[PDB]
Structure 1
Amino acid sequence: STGSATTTPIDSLDDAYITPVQIGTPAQTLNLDFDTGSSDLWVFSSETTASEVDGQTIYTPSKSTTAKLLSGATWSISYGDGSSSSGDVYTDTVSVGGLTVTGQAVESAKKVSSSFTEDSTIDGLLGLAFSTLNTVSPTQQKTFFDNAKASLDSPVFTADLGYHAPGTYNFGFIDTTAYTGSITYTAVSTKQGFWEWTSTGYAVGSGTFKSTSIDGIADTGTTLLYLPATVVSAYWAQVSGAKSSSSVGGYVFPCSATLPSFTFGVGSARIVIPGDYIDFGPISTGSSSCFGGIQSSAGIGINIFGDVALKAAFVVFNGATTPTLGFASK
């Protein structure tokens, strides 16, 4: 089997991407944030504290003839930005772009933090990291991909995120028309539950490539590119007037600037992030200070190849017995 679904930016800055997902019988379609940096499929629901729902579409398990309470199971998750959610668990039928999993754990939110409430466009998350990170207790649950894998034509999914435009998540096949040149594969460590890999270095603009190992995670659920302070400083030093602002919480730059590209290595291959991908616009409405899309990972404890990096590539998440990651230009 295979599946294919379009993923769409939630706003003009590509702050996140949403993908429609069918849950239950009859189908209830919710727009979920596909997140290769976590492993829970959770949704706003009829159980979510009413004051914490503001415009989201909810899953109502009592209206699904295939929903079953997973007795005794609860979940609770916190993300890298300090947001969180928790609740109980149902199993139900879940379909993505024509690919159907029966008995998928659908984690129903009883509580969500303010960042989720305030984002009317995201109805929940669909985790695509390794199932070892799933938070359901006392019986850990499998991700949608893990459940689908054995049925797929090939045990893979691909992320093809657009810059200020829709893109695609495919399950079970590699669309050879969706990228240019060849796909370069690179080793993955699953030890921390992430799609963790080692980039071979970087360049800033038309500058020379610096060969240096950068361990990090491929994380579609993180907006920006978080890299070591040395790398980030080298980037922003090429932008007149750019500075790190403690009050704003990262590097900012004059909105009048033309940003240089940023290249990262995948083995001997190179992915080029155009400068415009690194512009996240005014820090506040009407400001001439703009927020940078490349930020320091210092104090995160891990480097993160988030959407800024991933959207410059066609990315293969290969879930074979020994997982790997593939990157192609597009």
Structure 2
Amino acid sequence: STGSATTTPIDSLDDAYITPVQIGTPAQTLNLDFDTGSSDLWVFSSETTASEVDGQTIYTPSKSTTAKLLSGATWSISYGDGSSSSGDVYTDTVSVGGLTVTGQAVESAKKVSSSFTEDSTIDGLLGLAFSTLNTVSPTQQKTFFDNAKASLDSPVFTADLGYHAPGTYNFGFIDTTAYTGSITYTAVSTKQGFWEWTSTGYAVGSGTFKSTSIDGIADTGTTLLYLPATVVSAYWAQVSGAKSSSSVGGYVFPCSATLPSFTFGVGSARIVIPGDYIDFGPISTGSSSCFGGIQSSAGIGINIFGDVALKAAFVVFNGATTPTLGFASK
């Protein structure tokens, strides 16, 4: 089997991407944030505190003839930015782009933090990291990908995120028309539950490539590119007027600037992020100071190849016995 679904930026800045997911019988379609940095599938629901729901589409398990409460099971998750949610657990039928899993754990939110309440376009998350990170207690549950793996033509999914444009998540096959040149595969460590890999270095604009190992995670659920302070300083030094602002919380730059590209290494191959991808617009409405898409990972504790990086590539998440990551230009 295979699946294929279109993923859509939630706003003009590509702050995140939503993908329609069918849950239950008859289908309830919710737009979820596919997140290769977490491993819980959770949804706004009929059980979510009313004051904490603000425009989202909810899952109503009582209206699903295939929903079964998973007795005793609860979940609670906190994300890298301080967001959180928690609730109870059903199993139900979940389909993504024609690909169906029966008995998928659907984590129903009783509580969500304000940042989720404020994002009216995100109805929940669908985690695609390794199932070892799943927060369901007392019996940990598997991700959608993990559940589907055996049935897929090939045990892979691919992320093809658009810049200010729709893109595609595919399950079970590699669309050879979706990228240019070849796919370069690189080793993954699953020891922290992430799609963790090592970039072979970077360049800024037309500058010479610096060979240097950069350990980080491929994370579709993170907006920006978070890299070591040395790397990030080297980038923003090439932008006149750019500065790190503690009050704003990162590097800012004059909105009148033209940004240089940023290249990262995958083995011997190179992925080029166009400068426009690194512009996240005014820090506040009407401001002439703009927020940068490349930021320091210092104090995060890990480097993150988020959407800024991933949307410049066709990315293969290979879930073979020994997982690997593939990157191609597009």
TM-score after normalising by structure 1: 1.00
Instruction: Please give the alpha-carbon distance, in whole angstroms, between the structure 1 residues aligned to 2:147 and 2:259.
Output: 42
1:45-84 correspondence to structure 2 within 5 Å: 45-84=45-84
Instruction: Please give the alpha-carbon distance, in whole angstroms, between the structure 2 residues aligned to 1:206 and 1:25.
Output: 54
Deviation per CA, 1:22-48: give whole Å up to 9, x if none: 000000000000000000000000000
Deviation per CA, 1:49-107: give whole Å up to 9, x if none: 00000000000000000000000000000000000000000000000000000000000
- Please report how far the alpha carbon of residue 164 of structure 1 lies from its aligned counterpart in structure 2 after TM superposition: 0.1
Instruction: Please give the alpha-carbon distance, in whole angstroms, between the structure 2 residues aligned to 1:219 and 1:173.
Output: 20
Deviation per CA, 1:118-170: give whole Å up to 9, x if none: 00000000000000000000000000000000000000000000000000000
- Please report how far the alpha carbon of residue 110 of structure 1 lies from its aligned counterpart in structure 2 after TM superposition: 0.1
**Aligned with 1:132: secondary structure?**
helix
Instruction: Please give the alpha-carbon distance, in whole angstroms, between the structure 1 residues aligned to 2:89 and 2:20.
Output: 20
- Please report how far the alpha carbon of residue 111 of structure 1 lies from its aligned counterpart in structure 2 after TM superposition: 0.1
Does residue 1:247 correspond to 2:219, yes or no? no
Instruction: Please give the alpha-carbon distance, in whole angstroms, between the structure 1 residues aligned to 2:225 and 2:58.
Output: 31
Deviation per CA, 1:300-321: give whole Å up to 9, x if none: 0000000000000000000000
Instruction: Please give the alpha-carbon distance, in whole angstroms, between the structure 2 residues aligned to 1:119 and 1:271.
Output: 31
Instruction: Please give the alpha-carbon distance, in whole angstroms, between the structure 2 residues aligned to 1:281 and 1:164.
Output: 13
* Runs of 4+ that moved beyond 4 A: none
**Aligned with 2:149: secondary structure?**
helix
Deviation per CA, 1:250-273: give whole Å up to 9, x if none: 000000000000000000000000
Deviation per CA, 1:263-312: give whole Å up to 9, x if none: 00000000000000000000000000000000000000000000000000
- Please report how far the alpha carbon of residue 236 of structure 1 lies from its aligned counterpart in structure 2 after TM superposition: 0.0
Deviation per CA, 1:180-219: give whole Å up to 9, x if none: 0000000000000000000000000000000000000000
- Please report how far the alpha carbon of residue 16 of structure 1 lies from its aligned counterpart in structure 2 after TM superposition: 0.0
Aligned-residue CA RMSD (Å):
0.1
Aligned residues: 330
Instruction: Please give the alpha-carbon distance, in whole angstroms, between the structure 2 residues aligned to 1:200 and 1:4.
Output: 31
- Please report how far the alpha carbon of residue 226 of structure 1 lies from its aligned counterpart in structure 2 after TM superposition: 0.0
Instruction: Please give the alpha-carbon distance, in whole angstroms, between the structure 2 residues aligned to 1:220 and 1:74.
Output: 25
Instruction: Please give the alpha-carbon distance, in whole angstroms, between the structure 1 residues aligned to 2:192 and 2:238.
Output: 34
Instruction: Please give the alpha-carbon distance, in whole angstroms, between the structure 2 residues aligned to 1:81 and 1:261.
Output: 26
Instruction: Please give the alpha-carbon distance, in whole angstroms, between the structure 2 residues aligned to 1:74 and 1:277.
Output: 39
Instruction: Please give the alpha-carbon distance, in whole angstroms, between the structure 2 residues aligned to 1:237 and 1:186.
Output: 30
Instruction: Please give the alpha-carbon distance, in whole angstroms, between the structure 2 residues aligned to 1:204 and 1:17.
Output: 27
**Aligned with 2:146: secondary structure?**
helix
- Please report how far the alpha carbon of residue 179 of structure 1 lies from its aligned counterpart in structure 2 after TM superposition: 0.1
Q: Which runs of 5+ in 2 are unaligned?
A: none
**Aligned with 1:42: secondary structure?**
strand
Instruction: Please give the alpha-carbon distance, in whole angstroms, between the structure 1 residues aligned to 2:84 and 2:166.
Output: 27
Q: Which runs of 5+ in 1 are unaligned?
A: none
Does residue 1:85 correspond to 2:85, yes or no? yes
Instruction: Please give the alpha-carbon distance, in whole angstroms, between the structure 2 residues aligned to 1:51 and 1:116.
Output: 12
**Aligned with 2:253: secondary structure?**
strand
Instruction: Please give the alpha-carbon distance, in whole angstroms, between the structure 1 residues aligned to 2:306 and 2:69.
Output: 34
